[PDB]
């Protein structure tokens, strides 16, 4: 397994599941009509499921809403994964409550060493959680020679053992109440010297705000 623990039910209210017949990616609710996820999670038709804990059972607090507009970063590179970020506008606003809430965009870039919370159904039935720190760029660079750009950040452990895995992409990395990362890629999962790589959200706050205001 990926080393996480089952999150306390609805303790990560901003977490969403992207579904096109089955769960294939995660995402984060940033306001009542928009979700942020990874660009490699793009699909022409996407249904967003909010308020989920067990994605295989109808629990009663879920909200199912179709994506109305899917906007990938204009500079996304499918090969290098640079700028792996995408915005999804929902068909209608969701009802915000205790199980369905938004997460704040970063005020600034969090420094290495900051402890964060990574969540996803990745490894799917129950939402998994993982407490892990942002790693220094130098360490990230050493683990993935020539593959890390300034729009990426490594989060995890160089000894491996704990990590996000397939099914987690697009999901949140929240540190001190702010969305600092988006699950993107890695070589394997929980492998030593190959911690997960995440889209560094603080580099896109203006793009996000500008895009939402215009759409």
């Amino acid at each position: 397994d990926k080393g996480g623990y089952t999150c306390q039910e609805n303790s990560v209210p901003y977490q969403v599941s992207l579904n096109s017949g089955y769960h294939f990616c995660g995402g984060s609710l940033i306001n009542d009509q928009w979700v942020v996820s990874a660009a490699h999670c793009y699909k022409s038709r996407i249904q967003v499921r909010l308020g989920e804990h067990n994605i295989n059972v109808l629990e009663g607090n879920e909200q199912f809403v179709n994506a109305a507009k899917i906007i990938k970063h204009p500079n996304f590179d499918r090969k290098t994964l640079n700028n792996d970020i995408m915005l999804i506008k929902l068909s209608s606003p969701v009802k915000l409550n205790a199980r369905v809430a938004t997460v704040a965009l970063p005020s600034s870039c969090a420094p290495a060493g900051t402890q964060c919370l990574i969540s996803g159904w990745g490894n799917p039935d129950l939402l998994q959680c993982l407490d892990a720190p942002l790693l220094p760029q130098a360490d990230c660079e050493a683990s993935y020679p020539g593959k890390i750009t300034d729009n990426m950040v490594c989060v995890g452990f160089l000894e491996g053992g704990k990590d996000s895995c397939q099914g987690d992409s697009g999901g949140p990395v929240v540190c001190n109440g702010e969305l600092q990362g988006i699950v993107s890629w890695g070589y394997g999962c929980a492998l030593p010297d190959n911690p997960g790589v995440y889209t560094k959200v603080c580099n896109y706050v203006d793009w996000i705000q500008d895009t939402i205001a215009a759409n």
Partner: protein, 56 residues
Amino acid sequence: RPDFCLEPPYTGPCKARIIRYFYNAKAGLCQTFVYGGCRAKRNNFKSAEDCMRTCG
């Protein structure tokens, strides 16, 4: 048949969970595997029919 049909399925570095088809030589047929969402190799098909047509 083409060499890429005999290669093991390639999940890739991305962490999405997308079900794709790949031709399994040992089994002599196309089965499903989890693709990560990026950098697909050739033994990766959106459908069994395309998988069997190409690697049958």
